């Protein structure tokens, strides 16, 4: 909630990187079900979270 309130209303998608990293910090790695969850919370299409997940190297998909 604190993360999402850092961005203008109407631009929740800007929280994809921090919230996706928060999933990795809680779990250690990003399973497909973690990215699917971040898509639900921020209401961005899942494919747009898969793009972010595979673009940056600090995310562990294994």
């Amino acid at each position: 909630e604190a993360i999402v309130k850092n961005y203008p209303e109407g631009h929740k998608a800007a929280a994809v990187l921090p919230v996706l990293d928060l999933a990795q910090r809680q779990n250690g790695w990003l399973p497909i079900s973690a990215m699917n969850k971040v898509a639900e919370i921020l209401q961005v299409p899942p494919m747009r979270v898969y793009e972010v997940a595979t673009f940056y190297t600090m995310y562990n998909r294994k």
């Binding site: 850092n6 961005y7 990187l17 921090p18 990293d21 961005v44 972010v52 940056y56 600090m58 995310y59």
Partner: protein, 432 residues
């Protein structure tokens, strides 16, 4: 007067006076060294006065592009429409050889925070987003704490410094990408997408983050602006040659005895910089081979040019290279000069975002060719082929990462061609 010699910056004229973190980095210590002093008076002067001091000082972007900051920050001094305006501080610092912006963040966090407020005030910005690479988790945390102390002290937030100006300072962590250091690729990363640069126009001053007027500025450029306002533009402009003013943070790494970050005057001779601070080239000056004078993105120069080159934007341009981030990398005579540059092209092939064809396909191409020049597994005609390829990439890409993949190659081919042709000779006689 016009001192024609430069260097020997005195400890009283240094801006980043906590560069080594031997004094307290928190708010209490920072104010004891000058930070957050008379900031209210600076803000009440207004944006026109602030932009006046930045222009007069001749401050130029420390992020590597080296544009006039005063002119760049003036695109934001226009009447607003319905959109908010933002200042984005570029704390990504991914350039190999560069580590100056790391020191500022974890040892002088309050200088950056005051730069954001002063700089944000000049541009009419409602907040500053500080984008710091994800690897710097401890340096970002330090900055986040200093941001808290400023909030609790009334220095930022609602009615910042008591001046009746409302300002916010946000920290956003990256997730691993050298390409997100590019100004537009940073913006797309803040907005939640892949770090892929945008074409220009539009320019960020018109359409930036969230689609609003934005200015992206480096950590070091923002961090020095409050001091330029307190001490005046003329004081800053008193250093370095003309159109090359100010102090500058230098990293000296590679084959030196004492690698170190250090502050020194702009336009100091490169040799004097290495010898006095870094402890000389490993094995003595006569053991020097070539120096990359501004991080990997700039061409390397040989020992002959290194004798009498000055460290400023214009002196290095006429050396066919650039000041860049001013990250001096030294390579001594035992270095495999071909293999050093091959690893740089491998770095770029790993960082290219893949968006646009010349860099997606070209840099990956130059990586394959350089991998063979290291083994000598080629024929001399491929050297000129690689030169032509590097020119097809340069100036044809969306962003400057493509240009910076080519320039390392052009430097090696420009000055060490006999080294390349020599290594091809050995492989041929061995295998034939």
């Amino acid at each position: 007067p016009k001192k024609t010699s430069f260097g020997s910056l005195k400890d009283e004229d240094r801006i980043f006076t906590n560069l080594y973190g031997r004094h307290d980095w928190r708010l209490k210590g920072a104010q004891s060294r000058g930070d957050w002093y008379k900031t209210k008076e600076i803000l009440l002067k207004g944006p026109d006065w602030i932009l006046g001091e930045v222009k007069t000082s001749g401050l130029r972007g420390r992020g590597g592009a080296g544009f006039p900051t005063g002119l760049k920050w003036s695109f934001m001094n226009k009447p607003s429409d319905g959109r908010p305006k933002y200042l984005v501080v570029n704390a990504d610092e991914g350039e190999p050889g560069t580590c100056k912006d790391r020191e500022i963040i974890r040892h002088d966090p309050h200088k950056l925070v005051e730069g954001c407020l002063v700089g944000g005030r000049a541009m009419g910005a409602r907040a500053a987003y500080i984008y710091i690479r994800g690897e710097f988790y401890n340096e970002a945390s330090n900055l986040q704490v200093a941001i808290r102390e400023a909030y609790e002290a009334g220095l930022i937030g609602k009615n910042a410094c008591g001046s009746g100006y409302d300002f916010d300072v946000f920290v956003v962590r990256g997730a691993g990408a050298y390409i997100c250091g590019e100004e537009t690729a940073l913006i797309e990363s803040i907005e939640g997408k892949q770090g892929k640069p945008r074409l220009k126009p539009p320019f960020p001053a018109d359409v930036g983050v969230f689609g609003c007027p934005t200015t992206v500025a480096n950590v070091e450029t923002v961090a020095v602006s409050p001091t330029i306002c307190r001490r005046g533009g003329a004081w800053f402009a008193s250093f370095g040659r003309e159109r090359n003013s100010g102090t500058k943070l230098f990293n000296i790494s590679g084959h030196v005895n004492n690698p170190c970050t250090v502050e020194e005057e702009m336009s100091v001779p490169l040799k004097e910089l290495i010898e006095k601070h870094a402890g000389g080239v490993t094995g003595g000056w006569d053991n020097l081979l070539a120096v990359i004078p501004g991080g990997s993105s700039t061409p390397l120069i040989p020992k002959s040019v290194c004798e009498t080159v000055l460290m400023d934007f214009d002196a290095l341009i006429q050396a066919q290279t650039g000041l860049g981030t001013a990250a001096v990398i030294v390579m001594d005579r035992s270095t495999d000069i071909v293999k050093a540059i091959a690893r740089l092209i491998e770095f770029y092939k790993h960082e290219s975002c893949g968006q646009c064809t010349p860099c997606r396909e070209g840099v990956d191409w130059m990586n394959k060719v350089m991998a063979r020049f290291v083994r000598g597994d080629a024929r001399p005609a491929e050297i000129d082929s690689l030169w032509e390829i590097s020119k097809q990439i340069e100036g044809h890409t969306i962003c400057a990462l493509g240009d910076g993949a080519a320039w390392p190659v052009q430097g090696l081919i420009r000055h060490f061609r006999p080294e390349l042709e020599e290594r091809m000779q050995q492989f041929a006689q061995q295998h034939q």
